[PDB]
Amino acid sequence: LLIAVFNNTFFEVKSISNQVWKFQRYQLIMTFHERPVLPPPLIIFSHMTMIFQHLCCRWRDYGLKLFITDDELKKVHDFEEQCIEEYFREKDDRFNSSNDERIRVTSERVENMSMRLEEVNEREHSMKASLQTVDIRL
Amino acid sequence: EKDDRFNSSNDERIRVTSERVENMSMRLEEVNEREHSMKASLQTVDIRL
Amino acid sequence: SWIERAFYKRECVHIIPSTKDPHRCCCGRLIGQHVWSISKHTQLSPTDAFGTIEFQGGGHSNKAMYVRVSFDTKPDLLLHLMTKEWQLELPKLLISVHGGLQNFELQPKLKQVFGKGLIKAAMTTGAWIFTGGVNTGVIRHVGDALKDHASKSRGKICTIGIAPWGIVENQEDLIGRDVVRPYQTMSNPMSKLTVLNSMHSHFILADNGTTGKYGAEVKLRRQLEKHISLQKINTRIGQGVPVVALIVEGGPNVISIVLEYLRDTPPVPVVVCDGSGRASDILAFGHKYSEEGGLINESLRDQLLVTIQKTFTYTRTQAQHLFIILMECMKKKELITVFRMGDIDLAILTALLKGANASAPDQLSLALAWNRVDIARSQIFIYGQQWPVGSLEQAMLDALVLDRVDFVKLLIENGVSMHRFLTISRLEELYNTRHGPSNTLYHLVRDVKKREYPKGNLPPDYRISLIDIGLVIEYLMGGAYRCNYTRKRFRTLYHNLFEINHFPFPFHELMVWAVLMKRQKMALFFWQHGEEAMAKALVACKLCKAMAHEASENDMVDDISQELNHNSRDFGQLAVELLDQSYKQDEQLAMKLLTYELKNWSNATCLQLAVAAKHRDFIAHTCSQMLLTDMW
Amino acid sequence: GQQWPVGSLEQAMLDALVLDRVDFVKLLIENGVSMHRFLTISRLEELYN
């Protein structure tokens, strides 16, 4: 039974584990970026280095950004607005080219075209009555 | 046969029906709006004679 | 007992003039059936026909109050009946539908939309429908509309019909004093008298004494419509209630009814329909073929004359007088608009706008109150509308506090810019609004004031400053975040003031505000407009997740926590779909989007904000994985 | 314009109920027949028999 419950929950756990590992790659990378160069058996030298630096700064931003320019800010500011415009309007294209929208749009128009053609037929009956009356008069 | 499969598929048939109910509604609308001129002319002709 | 002692009635006591038929008198009743003063010699007495009518048969069972009154009664007494005895509030709108007394059939698409709107305006504005009472023609279509209303909708449309008392079938069936009388929807085809409509709400059956003849209700209905329009509306800005004149088809008489409404002080705008035929179609052909109002040329005048002479079967001179009355109506062309197929609503909502006759700020505030963006777009924001300075900004503030996203779209699209509108004081007034949907912002402010100054419950008359909003963003963001509100620059300007007070990036402050008070649709609108969308979406994701956790922690409503988690997932999905689009366009510029320092978000990084928001799908994406590999 | 005898609609309701005509029951309810005034003890026994 433990074999069975291990087998039948394997796929969901495997997908969640892969995705959680891919998420925690960032935590691993930033942690190892913030650690000192020297190993734990030799970290006392880097520790006294940070101690000496801290007392030197006292006696006298955790991340990895890129630091670009204003013209660059303008180019990435433009770059985002292509990505906005392409997204919403392709979403509009996907919605307009879908089957359920096409069937609904066809159906409401066969609505309007049947009532309107019916107006064309019922009004038309007046015109041949007028044409027969005109041919009768002349 | 790839052309036949593409032409007999559901998504092509629905699109081809839909663009034609487009053209047929705008064109019939032209039929109705132009028709209003003809019975106005027929009523005017019956009024004259 | 007040109805009998205030409202009067008149009964036919005359010399019985035979005219044509010896049994038929001047009042039309039978010669032995007896028991204005000219030839009827009628006498006044208290009424004995009022109360409630139980409509037996005809589908749904509906009870309609009724009263028989004299045709010469003062309208103030009748209006006092309606407000006090029938417990009817003063309507925001009066609806006056007229048409032909003969029965007719219209197009099915025309009829269905005609019904579906006449219901919907009388729902949304809480209007009063004024019909002809008896179940003939246009009133029959109103009753079919109200039948569809009862079959699919939950309102009680107050749909008062005014009919002559003498023409209703089974007059002895409605005799009583505050007694429920059953009524038959049965209507005999042999009898010339017609039954009342089954799906009406109240009746003002008016007796001039005569039986089987019309004309006993037109003057009383008009004078009552004038008296109600003289009453001030509850807004108390200096306007009465506005009145529409609804016309479906009609005959010769509705032409003069239109003329009386247009040539009135105040003017009553007059609205027809097309497709029904007869008089409504000839107002239609007159209106499209009109040029400059009364300036009608020779070819279209004789076309109008021959169609009047053919449809109405009138003589050469009679068509000429009806064309004269038509031209007198056409002089006031701006009041008449035609409904030509391909509703009742636009009809009514337009008559509200020019019956108010106020400035365009007043029309815009009215349409904002009705939540009608399409009506405001087609009428108020037409070409040729003059606008006062600063009024559009006030309407922007009113649309923002009353959760009208579609009015915000229209106002931005009509010249209003967010940079020139958003100030510090306006954003505080937004953060202290009491309208709109509920929110958990007050609990967040109370918690951060308790944490900052361990007091307790905030006073009820507390104005939430932007510094307190800044602290709320601090508690929700977590970590080492630092909001622009709580920095020393913003506190200095707040102390020194309560384009320096204008926000350089107003859509960011709007996004934070719409996220905080749980307004999802406006948050999605404000995400599209403005810049730093990926930063804004990740910030909104963390804010919605943190407020969901906070709502679950304080034992609040679980539905609030579920909806906040749904909003967090929607903003996170927006961030992934933006990342996909950036990766498809340019891989490098996507990475520079992912890494550049966000000065408006505490010098953070989009990559940091996604990890803080615990958005797993953003990091597991291939672009972020290869960026992390490059960092490795 | 259809005149109806008193008590005949209730008999037609009883006949529609015993002859499994749901759509005739819908029409008779929609034409004024109320179930509260029709169902008695003796009528429900006649249905059960």
Judge whether C622 is closer than 8 Å to chain A, CB to CB. no
Rounded Cα distance, C406 and C315, in Å: 54
**Structure-token pair, residue C271:** 């609205």
Contact present, C583 and C589 (Cβ < 8 Å): no
D1/C189 Cβ within 8 A:
yes
Per-window interface: B 6-25 vs A, CB < 8 A: 10-11, 14-15, 17-18, 21-22, 24-25
The rounded distance, in Å, linking the Cα atoms of A14 and A11 is 5
How far does D4 lie from chain C, in Å, by closest CA? 9
User: Please, what is the Cα angle at C321 between C315 and C323, to 5 degrees?
Assistant: 100
Q: Is A29 exposed, middle or buried (0-12, 13-18, 19+ CB in 10 A)?
A: middle
Contact B43 C310 (CB under 8 A): yes
Q: How far apart (Å, rounded) are the C-alpha atoms in residues C11 and C103?
A: 29
CB contact under 8 A, B25 and A113: yes
Q: Are C66 and C50 in contact (CB under 8 A)?
A: yes
Which residues does residue A95 pair with via DSSP β-bridges, in sequence order? none
DSSP reduced 3-state for C98: strand
List the structure tokens of C207: 């007796």
C252 Cβ neighbours under 8 A, 6+ residues apart: C279, C312, C322
Query: What is the pairing mode between strands C8-11 and C43-46?
Result: antiparallel
DSSP-based three-state secondary structure for C11:
strand
Put simply, whether C112 touches A (Cβ < 8 Å) is: no
Judged by CB atoms closer than 8 Å, whether chains meet at D2 and C186 is answered as yes
d(CA C497, CA C494): 5
How far apart are alpha carbons C549 and C543 in whole angstroms?
Answer: 10
**C295, containing H or E segment:** none
Name the 3-class secondary structure at C51: strand
In chain C, the residue whose alpha carbon lies closest to the alpha carbon of A85 is C528
A78 Cβ under 8 Å from any chain C Cβ: no
**What Cα–Cα distance (Å) separates residue C205 from each residue in C156, C160, C375?**
21, 10, 36
Burial C359-395 (b: 16+ CB within 10 A, else e): ebbbbbbbbbeeebbebbbebbbeeeeebeeeebbeb
CA pair distance C252, C410, nearest whole angstrom: 43
Q: Which amino acid is at C24?
A: R
List C-alpha distances in Å: B10 to A95, A96, A102, A104, C463. 17, 16, 12, 15, 61
CA C397 to CA C395: how far, in whole Å? Answer: 5
Interface touch C186/D4, C-beta < 8 Å: yes
Task: Of C189, C207, C199, give the one whose Cα is nearest residue C155.
Answer: C199
Contact C441, C517 (CB under 8 A): yes
Judged on CB neighbours under 10 Å (0-12, 13-18, 19+), C437 is exposed
Compute CA distances C369 → C233, C240, C358, C375, C432, whole Å: 15, 17, 16, 12, 20
CA distance C278 to C296: 20
| C60 vs D31: CA distance, rounded Å | 9
Contacts of C582 by beta carbon, 8 Å cutoff, 6+ apart: A79, A80, A83, C534, C589, C590, C593, C623
- Give me the residue from C593, C595, C631 closest to A29, CB to CB: C631
Question: Which residues of A are less than 8 Å from C108 in CB distance?
Answer: 115
Bridge partners of C96?
C130, C245
Q: Strand C176-184 vs strand C243-248: parallel, antiparallel, or unpaired?
A: unpaired
Q: What are the φ/ψ torsions at residue B4 (nearest 5 degrees)?
A: -70, -40
* CA C551 – CA C542 distance, rounded (Å): 14
Which helix (H) or strand (E) is C207 found in, with range? strand C206-207
Q: Give start and end residues of each alpha helix (H) in C478-615.
A: 488-497, 506-516, 520-528, 533-553, 558-585, 587-595, 606-612
Task: Give the three-class secondary structure for C134.
Answer: strand
Q: Which of residues 56-75 of C touch D (CB under 8 A)?
A: 56-59, 61
Compute the Cα dihedral for C290, C296, C297, C301 and give only its sign.
Answer: positive
Both structure tokens of D17:
């109920």
Q: How many CA atoms lie within 13 A of C425 on its CB side?
A: 4
Q: Inspect the interface and report whether the beta carbons of D4 and C59 lie closer than 8 Å.
A: no
CA separation, residue C551 to residues B25, C477, C554, C569, C614 (Å): 53, 15, 5, 17, 18
Q: Which two tokens stand for residue C25?
A: 């008198």
Residue A65 to residue C606: CA distance in whole angstroms: 9
Determine how many CB atoms are found less than 10 A away from the CB of residue C216. 22
SS3 call for C424: helix
Give whole-number Cα distances, A110 to A117, B12, B21, B23, C341, in Å.
10, 19, 7, 12, 16
Residue A17 with chain C: CB contacts under 8 Å: none
Q: Which two tokens stand for residue C461?
A: 């008359």
Answer for the pair C287, C338: CB distance below 8 angstroms, yes or no.
yes
CA nearest to C14, candidates C1, C24, C2, C26: C26
Is the peptide bond preceding residue C22 cis, with omega within 30 degrees of 0?
no
d(CA C466, CA C485): 6
* Whether D31 and C57 lie within 8 Å, measured CB to CB: yes
In angstroms, rounded to a whole number, what is the distance separating the alpha carbons of residues A132 and C295?
36
Four-residue CA torsion sign, C280, C283, C286, C288: negative
Residue C478 CB neighbour total at 10 angstroms: 10
